[PDB]
Amino acid sequence: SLLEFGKMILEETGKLAIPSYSSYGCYCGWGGKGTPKDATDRCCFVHDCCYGNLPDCNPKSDRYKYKRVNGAIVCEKGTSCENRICECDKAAAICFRQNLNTYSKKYMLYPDFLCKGELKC
Ligand SMILES: CN(C)Cc1c[nH]c2c(CCCO)cccc12
Numbered sequence: 001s002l003l004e005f006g007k008m009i010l011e012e013t014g015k016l017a018i019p020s021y022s023s024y025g026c027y028c029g030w031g032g033k034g035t036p037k038d039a040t041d042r043c044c045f046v047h048d049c050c051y052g053n054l055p056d057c058n059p060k061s062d063r064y065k066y067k068r069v070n071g072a073i074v075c076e077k078g079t080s081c082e083n084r085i086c087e088c089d090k091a092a093a094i095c096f097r098q099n100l101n102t103y104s105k106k107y108m109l110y111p112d113f114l115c116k117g118e119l120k121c
Pocket of ligand 1: 002005006017018021022027028029030043044045047048092
């Protein structure tokens with residue numbers, strides 16, 4: 001769920017999910033259109049695609065468990081939707097940590113009309 005995703009992000013990056021990553025670029029948050037603006041936005045695109053592979057799961061509301069094994073994220077065994085949702089989120093949080101150095105505040109509150117183009121998962 002958003003509750004676990006949020007905590008994972010803050011743990012990884014030191015930033016709070018809302019509003020560092022809920023209105024960034026074309027894909028972090030609401031958006032699902034155009035070309036991702038930078039590497040952080042591409043993490044959100046791949047995260048959305050990840051969720052798109054689970055049409056019968058409910059990643060916003062279904063809760064899973066995960067633990068830290070010295071830093072490393074380990075998804076705990078739950079239902080199969082929970083395990084797969086956790087893997088999507090874990091990947092995104094790592095993707096965000098890996099691109100913290102190019103995160104730009106110019107992409108916060110990014111306007112819709114500037115999200116132009118096509119990109120298939
Ligand atoms: C639901 N609302 C209350 C908050 C919210 C919507 N989308 C979010 C994403 C998606 C970014 C990753 O693709 C990350 C963190 C929080 C949110």
